[PDB]
Sugar phosphate isomerase (Microbacterium testaceum), 866 residues
Amino acid sequence: MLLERDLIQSVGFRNVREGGEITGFQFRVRMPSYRGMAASLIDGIGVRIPGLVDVGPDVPLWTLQGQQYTLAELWDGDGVRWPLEDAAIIFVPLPGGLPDGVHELSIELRLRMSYIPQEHQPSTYRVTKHVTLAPEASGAPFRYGVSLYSYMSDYGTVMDLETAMASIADLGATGIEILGEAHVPNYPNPSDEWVEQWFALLSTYGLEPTNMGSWIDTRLHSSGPNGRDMTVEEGAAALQRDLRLAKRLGFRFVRPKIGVVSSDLIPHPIWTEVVEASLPLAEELDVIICPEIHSPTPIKHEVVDDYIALIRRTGTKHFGLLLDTGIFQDRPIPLKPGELPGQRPAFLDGIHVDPNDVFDVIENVVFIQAKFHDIDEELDDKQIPWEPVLKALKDAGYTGYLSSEYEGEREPWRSIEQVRRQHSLIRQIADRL
Amino acid sequence: MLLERDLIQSVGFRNVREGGEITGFQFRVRMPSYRGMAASLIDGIGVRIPGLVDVGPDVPLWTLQGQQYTLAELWDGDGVRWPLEDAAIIFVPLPGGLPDGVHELSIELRLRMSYIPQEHQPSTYRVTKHVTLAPEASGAPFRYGVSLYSYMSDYGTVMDLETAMASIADLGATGIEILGEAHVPNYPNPSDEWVEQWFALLSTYGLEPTNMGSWIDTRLHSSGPNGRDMTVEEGAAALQRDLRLAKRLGFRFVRPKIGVVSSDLIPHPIWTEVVEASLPLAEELDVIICPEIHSPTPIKHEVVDDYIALIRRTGTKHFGLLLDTGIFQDRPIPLKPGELPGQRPAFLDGIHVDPNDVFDVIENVVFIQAKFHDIDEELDDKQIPWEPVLKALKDAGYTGYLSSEYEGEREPWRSIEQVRRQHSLIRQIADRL
Ligand SMILES: [Mn+2]
Ligand SMILES: [Mn+2]
């Protein structure tokens, strides 16, 4: 598993329970040095959160290689190491723990390097990070998941599958959503080694697969001298291939993204006979087909009414709706540096769907992608009004998943902290209701 | 293997030879989208290097999943994909290839997304990167290696062992140097699975292990009420444990870093009987012990003369010297933001050893760590005068390794491009001589 560049890691910042009592909190620290060293060279860590915690360097306890020690036990110990590949787990005693939210955590880590003269010793590392506590809030009635699209540029550059899965299980989320054409290696035929390893990681971290994203590329052969349009048989075979891979990996929903033929995102005309050809296969494998309702398409739209008309005409239980919460955005996404207003499309200011419009279509919504762009250190969302949205979902009777979809700036490791802030914000709102 | 955040990757930017003729150059591109797609959705890549290359979007060739195609073959193809985990290899036809150095490479990649309206299509990605060509210069008589210390904060956060080894083999380097207490997992007892995997990767990328860095922490039990000093038997067992692990992994040199007892970096007094106790084990395993000569210690020093006196007294062939080229630094390392002059030590301005002082000790130098901090796009080093240094090494008869040690700013992925610039600079100087 990979770590972050910040010494204080976001994953693992939790409260610690011993016998039903919260006895303190913990967090994980990356080794700042270029090597891992023996644990007796540790000279302590001082932990400070302003207003809540201020402990000295000898107060916290160290979990190194699966065993917890005090600092005096580390000084007399032998054989215990802080490896470079491992993050040290620092337990700070605080009866009752920390409250939910983002905390300004400041550490003062001391290490003894023997090759440095004694006057410049110990080596001191002072970092400050705004870290989000793993949510103590039990956000019933919703279930909580994370889409791997939230780590868009992070996956494959700073993150692999196990590091992403470890971060999802640390939030307390139980679902994981992938894009199948991005996160399944050797698509569409993963090896039997990978599929058995994929099922091992789901039982390790306690995650269940929920949604697999799919595409039906209608402009697959549009370019060239022999440029043509995708037919129904080539289009139905694309969706049927994705339903079999989602059944093979344990997923429950498939979201097909059909190509468009106009500026209003009107779907390609083959979609209604591609989907109806694959509804026999979906009912056999028990996977629900759910196309996405995302901005600039509001709920009161002709495209959305075509999805509801397809369910009543066919009478199927394996077609549903996926709701993207970017349609509820009321404040504009900020301007990228280098552009003036006018050349970006006008739906990036938010289309402002009133959240009471979910009452019309909630009996066909099977899955919700919690789309967001920016949450600051006060747990204030900058684009989505989460409190009237979650109030309308709760009163309409939604009890399914809310998968995080981070859409913000793809700064490296920024998406890890942002998804933590969203689960902390949503679970705190759902307890306030 | 992991990739970099930049679309243009530094690793793989080479010249391409077909039948002994350089027919063009290649480079690798990360997929900018959030998914991998079928290769017929590619609408071309336009490649421009100012003054040398300017080709259209349909001119380069694409190597996807182990097979090379033209753009017209991609448009009619079926089943070929650009996976998200793979970087596409772009062959640009240019008879004769590019010269050595850093090139301002500008691409204009076009991809067709079917879910986007036709007026905003194709999706265009324009990035510019200063990338270093893999060196065409054959820098004889030296051999070339990379130390994994060059990727100090990158290893474990953005990089693993195979990604680091793939980048070393792309330079044309043949040696790899590790720090054993940092890069061997479960130190000092790696699993038999890891050791067999470590030997598989060395034969895959054609690397031989050269140097393993070691520490003898004399302040291991200095803190606490029972604080004591490290004895000879505890110190000799530390060095003997590291010689056995370096013999197990195939390394030829061990560099022990002993702790100091004064401001002049005078070594701990146990060092001369720790080393002489381990010289029987070194001659049996055929590993050379080589302590490091690094700044602020010059070559004309009392510490260095003690190493030469130990070789003549014992008469051993398994003790040698390691030369760190930070002692030849003549221009100052720039000030970190936030400090004024005076609180940093005065050897960070460079101690300015004249490079003709290697003629005194070259018969005991077995290994050289090519230390550097900054090389810009004109292949100009900012701290080390590489041309008189390499001229003195060549005339003294050195024919061993020059392992890269990057010491600069630990910006993420910065160390990959910096080590490429150093091998390009050194091999070009060694051909100018
Ligand atoms: Mn979405
Ligand atoms: Mn060095």
About this structure: Residues 143-432 of chain A form a domain with the TIM Barrel fold (CATH 3.20.20.150). Chain A is about 25% helix and 25% strand. Residues 414-432 of chain A form the longest helix (19 residues).
